[PDB]
Design a protein around this ligand. Structure first.
Ligand SMILES: *CCC(=O)Nc1ccccc1Nc1nc(NC2CCOCC2)ncc1Cl
Length: 340
């Protein structure tokens, strides 16, 4: 078995000439030459079987990505694992090799208004498919958006995804930890479990703001500072929006704050296209019920050069917690069997 910086990376004989790329959420990722398709690919090594939560996340990532088939969602090209459950200690997921991620691109490159428009169109096009499958990504952020050399965008990492459940979305104040802090909708901190499609729209709004300025718009230093950054720009919520917050702890917290005025988007982003700012405003709406939906966002004038509903497909079959790690290991073994 081949080795990559003091760790086994057993993918041969199909995959050779390994090169370390970096560390993903669940471990080492390498690039390799696929001797069958004659191209370089990306290979993620996952070792999840000792922990139930690691098994849950790996199972979600695989089951979701194998069901999805969309130009703007990273696929799974192959899955490598031992022939028997007893010998399976790791799983290798093979995916198309991309040139960069939006996180890395935002750290060093200025994006033209044309690139912002095209990237936002592709994110929304992929999100339309995901949401049409009744799935919430729940961790949209720049590092989860891969780009190839021609700026084709692919959404990745469905390990934190959930089936939408708007009826069971209500919860207490300061309980929920959905998404990565900077991209977390205000309702997560107030009264939401993050089980509605509006959570993903918020994250996309955050990504759009970050493409406009190359800096996160709400860079909370910790969990409890996130809402302060949001309110610092959006201003105090209206009486109508507070009436939607029935939980007394969350409502009274918001009522205890001094009045804050809205910071105009045009002052925050003076170089931004006015149509981009109108859409940003609709995505970064405090009240989740008034927040724009993915299909409405695609139809916004900012995206008029790309908008084509006949070329924005939906899922053919939508998707409709305490399983021990032994059972989850068997389910991962069954879901990966097709690649043997
Ligand atoms: C879906 C997010 C993910 O897997 N990210 C990741 C983190 C670290 C290394 C590799 C990956 N995945 C990945 N990377 C690439 N290309 C790299 C090239 C170098 O710049 C970063 C992206 N291609 C595919 C995949 Cl799955």
């Amino acid at each position: 078995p081949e080795m990559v910086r003091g760790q086994v990376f057993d993918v041969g004989p199909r995959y050779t000439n390994l090169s370390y790329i970096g560390e993903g959420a669940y471990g080492m990722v390498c690039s390799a030459y696929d001797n069958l398709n004659k191209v370089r690919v990306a290979i993620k090594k996952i070792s999840p079987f000792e922990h139930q939560t690691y098994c849950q996340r790996t199972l979600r990532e695989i089951k979701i990505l194998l069901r999805f088939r969309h130009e703007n969602i990273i696929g799974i090209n192959d899955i490598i694992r031992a022939p028997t459950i007893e010998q399976m200690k790791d799983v290798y997921i093979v995916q198309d090799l991309m040139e960069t991620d939006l996180y890395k691109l935002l750290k060093t490159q200025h994006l033209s208004n044309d690139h912002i428009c095209y990237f936002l169109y592709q994110i929304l096009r992929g999100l339309k498919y995901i949401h049409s499958a009744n799935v919430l990504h729940r961790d949209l952020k720049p590092s989860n958006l891969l780009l190839n050399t021609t700026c084709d965008l692919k959404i990745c990492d469905f390990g934190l995804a959930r089936v939408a459940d708007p009826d069971h979305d209500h919860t207490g104040f300061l309980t929920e930890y959905v998404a990565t802090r900077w991209y977390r909708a205000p309702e997560i901190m107030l009264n939401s479990k993050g089980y509605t499609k509006s959570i993903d729209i918020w994250s996309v709004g955050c990504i759009l703001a970050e493409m406009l300025s190359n800096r996160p718009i709400f860079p909370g230093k910790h969990y409890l500072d996130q809402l302060n950054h949001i309110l610092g720009i959006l201003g105090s919520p209206s009486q109508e929006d507070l009436n939607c917050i029935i939980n007394l702890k969350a409502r009274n917290y918001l009522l205890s704050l001094p009045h804050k005025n809205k910071v105009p988007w045009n002052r925050l982003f003076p170089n931004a296209d006015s149509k981009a700012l109108d859409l940003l405003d609709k995505m970064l709406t405090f009240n989740p019920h008034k927040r724009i939906e993915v299909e409405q966002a695609l139809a916004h004038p900012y995206l008029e050069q790309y908008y084509d509903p006949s070329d924005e497909p939906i899922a053919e079959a939508p998707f409709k917690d305490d399983l021990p790690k032994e059972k989850l290991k068997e389910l991962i073994f069954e879901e990966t069997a097709r690649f043997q």
